[PDB]
Design a protein around this ligand. Structure first.
Ligand SMILES: *[C@@H]1O[C@H](CO)[C@@H](O[C@@H]2O[C@H](CO)[C@@H](O)[C@H](O)[C@H]2NC(C)=O)[C@H](O)[C@H]1NC(C)=O
Ligand SMILES: *[C@@H]1O[C@H](CO)[C@@H](O[C@@H]2O[C@H](CO)[C@@H](O)[C@H](O)[C@H]2NC(C)=O)[C@H](O)[C@H]1NC(C)=O
Ligand SMILES: *[C@@H]1O[C@H](CO)[C@@H](O)[C@H](O)[C@H]1NC(C)=O
Ligand SMILES: *[C@@H]1O[C@H](CO)[C@@H](O)[C@H](O)[C@H]1NC(C)=O
Ligand SMILES: *[C@@H]1O[C@H](CO)[C@@H](O)[C@H](O)[C@H]1NC(C)=O
Ligand SMILES: *[C@@H]1O[C@H](CO)[C@@H](O)[C@H](O)[C@H]1NC(C)=O
Ligand SMILES: *[C@@H]1O[C@H](CO)[C@@H](O)[C@H](O)[C@H]1NC(C)=O
Ligand SMILES: *[C@@H]1O[C@H](CO)[C@@H](O)[C@H](O)[C@H]1NC(C)=O
Ligand SMILES: *[C@@H]1O[C@H](CO)[C@@H](O)[C@H](O)[C@H]1NC(C)=O
Lengths: 668, 139
């Protein structure tokens, strides 16, 4: 039971409260134990506890005197117990409680007044009980209560009198989810002084009972309303009529299997700002279906439409100008849908749209022509996501309508083509382009000549072709900072591929075939493609088949901090190859063929490191191979994980399998 | 491989083997050709080729073998015609290849590309040097 300021006793098999703890302990966690009871005498020593989490135990009942020994108790958690009965004296002395959690206690009913005495209580949780009513008292108490959780009970109706005890309470959260409520008596929500949030998830209401509830919620202070999985199959223009008399800001209608939304179904919500409609079954979206929602800023439509059906091929249909009402919309999410395509006025009217996600939103979007995004011309779009749409071809001026765009994600598609460079015309403010995991991309001289402001370019797993053009395709990218070219099986690179890219910081080249370029027998000499990269910080050259490293390939990389060279075939390294790496913090050389670690090579590299990774190597445990290295290991602050297990000698056979760190250098 | 008394040719090349159980070849008395190249073999148990009294061709190229010792290769190297252990990281030390280099010095078995592809790997003093040029006068 480790404890310095908070005491935790989780899964300690404790049957009684330990009596050997610091006196000044304020938090005592006793969850998942076998505490049968909580006698006050065992808590006499602890007179300064603030939070006592005793849930998930076998407490059947408590005593009022327990709160006498804890005058400063604030949070009391009795989750998952069997306190089926409560008394008016049970919580009388606990006058400073803020949170009282009584979930899953098999409480059947509340008799007279178990919560009258406490006045500073903020949240009361009574979920997963057997309660059949909201009756918690007779007089008016719980003045400062803000959250009332009553989920997963047996409550079947709401009555005004049952809630009358909350006349002076401003309920910020009223959770009634998973209770089969079938009747909302008039004035039931007007009993609460101020109700700000109501949750009715997993409560089978239906359109008619929804209309009754909305009429019952009128002229209240409600701001958040959640009706997820409420069996709301259809909506009409009279469904939320009562909500005309409130200032609702958030509405949740997800998982309702909603099929048809009538025109002006939400015209009663002029102040709505957050709308959630994910995971529904909408067949057709009409022009006036979203009419009257001009204050909405966030709309979620993920998985909101009917899926592909092989019986009738009834793809969901979105009428044109169906979003023209959303003048203040800024964030639109439409992922995981089966929309056939993008029409000429799909997004017309969205004059404040800044984020649009269309990841996996379409079934047949193969070609991105110059008319695809014309409806987004007047939107100030900054981020566009188009992943997983099986896009195959991008034509010229495809994104010419997006002049303010900064992030464009086109990965996880089937784009196989040659980048002529005309696809990026009009992208005057672009910063990031993601193209990883496509069919094949072939570069040319002017592939990126039209986007000089680019800063991040990801080209992983695209089977890059012609990256070795005599004028480098990356030459115009003077502001480029992150470049990813991994897993492309690239074999040939010219020495001026990265010339002029003084701002480059991250370069990923792992899982290519660049081994031949660094061999001294390569015709014309080794290729020095890392020159001039003064600001480079992260270099990844893992799994390229390298056998040898030219001595002067890292000479210009003064600010380099992380270099990864594992999974290569490196055995012998030239001396003074890491001389200029004066700021190196992480070196990775695992799963190579390295046998000796010597000062003339690794001296400057091992100067001030944080992490070292040279695990699966055939170390030759000899006084001229690892003596300096093992002495360095003996005294060093660099973190070397799995040092005692995966750093094993290979030769001589006397040392085969022995740990490198246990090599004895006393006779060197 | 048990019970195969009349087996003559065995090919186990490129199976990813790391270790060989000591008693896998015990019943193969008439075995003449065994191919174990392109595996990941480094350490072999002693007396693993004891019963191969008629072995004529042994192939162990492109493995991870570092030491060739009498307790393993003694009976195997008795009367051979061909030996193939070319691309291996030989540890040129007096306890790793001294018996092997002495055996190479006087033997009638044909060892092609002995002077070029049998190169030391460790210690770094010997890295790249031919195995056959190892000096055992100070062993
Ligand atoms: C007391 O400790 C328990 C166990 O660590 C906390 O209960 C849950 O523990 C699981 C497993 O670590 C977490 O996944 C949950 O998130 C924890 N519950 C919550 C609500 O976060 C318990 O919360 C701790 N109690 C206090 C007062 O810190
Ligand atoms: C575009 O949307 C996709 C899908 O929602 C995002 O992909 C997720 O990215 C996060 C963070 O990288 C990962 O943890 C998830 O696993 C990804 N999901 C899938 C299905 O791959 C992607 O990040 C978005 N792109 C941008 C630029 O926001
Ligand atoms: C608390 O409720 C009582 C009874 O309705 C009322 O008289 C009193 O003014 C309320 N307190 C406040 C601060 O409104
Ligand atoms: C809300 O109050 C207004 C103004 O008093 C009233 O006209 C309307 O009928 C009320 N709504 C309901 C559902 O009673
Ligand atoms: C209302 O909903 C929004 C969005 O889900 C949330 O951020 C906010 O906290 C909610 N209001 C209250 C009072 O909890
Ligand atoms: C709802 O729409 C119908 C169909 O046009 C219309 O007759 C009715 O008046 C509308 N309801 C309200 C409350 O306006
Ligand atoms: C109203 O809805 C019906 C069917 O839901 C649709 O045919 C009609 O066009 C809609 N009204 C307008 C003005 O679009
Ligand atoms: C799109 O390209 C076609 C073919 O070049 C051209 O005829 C058409 O005018 C272009 N569209 C726009 C809006 O420029
Ligand atoms: C590159 O960044 C610098 C500094 O922010 C800026 O002056 C320059 O305009 C940028 N280049 C382009 C083409 O946006």
């Amino acid at each position: 039971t480790v404890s310095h300021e908070v005491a935790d006793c989780s899964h300690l098999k404790l049957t009684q409260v330990p009596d050997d703890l610091p006196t000044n302990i304020t938090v005592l966690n006793l969850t998942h134990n076998q505490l049968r009871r909580l006698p006050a005498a065992n808590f006499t020593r602890y007179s300064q506890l603030t939070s006592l989490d005793v849930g998930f135990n076998t407490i059947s009942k408590l005593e009022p005197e327990l709160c006498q020994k804890l005058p400063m108790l604030k949070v009391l958690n009795l989750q998952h117990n069997e306190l089926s009965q409560l008394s008016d004296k049970t919580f009388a002395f606990c006058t400073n409680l803020t949170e009282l959690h009584l979930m899953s206690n098999s409480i059947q009913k509340i008799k007279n007044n178990p919560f009258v005495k406490q006045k500073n209580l903020i949240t009361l949780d009574l979920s997963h009980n057997g309660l059949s009513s909201t009756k918690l008292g007779t007089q008016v108490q719980l003045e400062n209560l803000q959250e009332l959780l009553l989920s997963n009970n047996k409550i079947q109706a709401l009555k005004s009198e049952e809630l009358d005890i909350f006349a002076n309470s401003s309920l910020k959260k009223l959770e009634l989810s998973s209770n089969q409520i079938k009747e909302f008596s008039p004035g039931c929500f007007h009993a609460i002084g101020r109700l700000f949030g109501l949750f009715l998830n997993n409560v089978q209401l239906g359109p008619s009972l929804t209309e009754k509830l909305c009429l019952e919620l009128a002229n209240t202070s409600i701001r958040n309303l959640s009706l997820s999985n409420s069996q709301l199959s259809t909506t009409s223009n009279t469904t939320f009529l009562g909500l005309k008399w409130t200032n609702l800001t958030m509405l949740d209608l997800s998982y309702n299997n909603l099929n048809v939304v009538g025109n002006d179904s939400f015209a009663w919500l002029p102040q709505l700002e957050y709308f959630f409609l994910e995971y529904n079954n909408i067949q057709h979206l009409f022009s006036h279906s979203l009419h009257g929602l001009f204050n909405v800023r966030y709309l979620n439509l993920k998985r909101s439409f009917t899926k592909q059906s092989i019986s009738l091929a009834s793809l969901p249909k979105i009428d044109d100008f169906s979003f023209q009402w959303l003048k203040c919309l800024e964030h639109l999410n439409m992922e995981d849908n089966d929309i056939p395509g993008i029409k000429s006025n799909m997004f017309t009217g969205l004059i404040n749209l800044k984020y649009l996600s269309l990841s996996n939103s379409f079934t047949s979007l193969r070609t991105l022509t110059n008319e695809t995004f014309v409806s987004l011309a007047h939107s100030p779009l900054h981020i566009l996501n188009l992943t997983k749409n099986k896009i195959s071809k991008i034509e010229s001026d495809a994104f010419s309508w997006l002049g303010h765009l900064e992030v464009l994600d086109l990965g996880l598609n089937e784009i196989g083509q040659e980048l002529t460079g005309q696809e990026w015309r009009g992208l005057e403010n672009i910063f990031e382009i993601y193209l990883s995991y496509n069919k094949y991309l072939q570069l040319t001289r002017n592939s990126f000549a039209l986007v000089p402001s680019l800063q991040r370019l990801m080209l992983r797993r695209v089977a890059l072709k012609n990256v070795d053009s005599s004028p480098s395709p990356f030459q115009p990218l003077r502001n480029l900072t992150i470049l990813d070219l991994s897993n492309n099986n690239i074999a040939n690179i010219n020495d001026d591929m990265l010339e002029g890219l003084e701002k480059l910081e991250i370069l990923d080249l792992q899982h290519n075939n660049l081994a031949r370029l660094w061999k001294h027998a390569n015709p014309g000499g080794p290729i020095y493609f890392l020159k001039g990269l003064s600001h480079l910080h992260i270099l990844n050259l893992e799994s390229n088949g390298f056998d040898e490293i030219p001595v002067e390939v890292f000479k210009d990389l003064f600010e380099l901090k992380i270099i990864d060279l594992g999974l290569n075939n490196l055995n012998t390294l030239p001396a003074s190859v890491f001389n200029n790496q004066v700021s190196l913090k992480s070196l990775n050389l695992q799963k190579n063929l390295i046998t000796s670690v010597e000062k003339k090579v690794f001296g400057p590299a091992f100067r001030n490191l944080t992490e070292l990774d040279m695990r699966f190597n055939p170390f030759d445990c000899t006084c001229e191979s690892i003596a300096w290295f093992v002495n360095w290991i003996n005294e060093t602050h660099t973190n070397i994980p799995e040092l005692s297990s995966h750093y094993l000698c290979n030769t001589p056979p006397h040392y085969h399998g022995f740990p490198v760190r246990l090599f004895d250098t006393s006779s060197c």
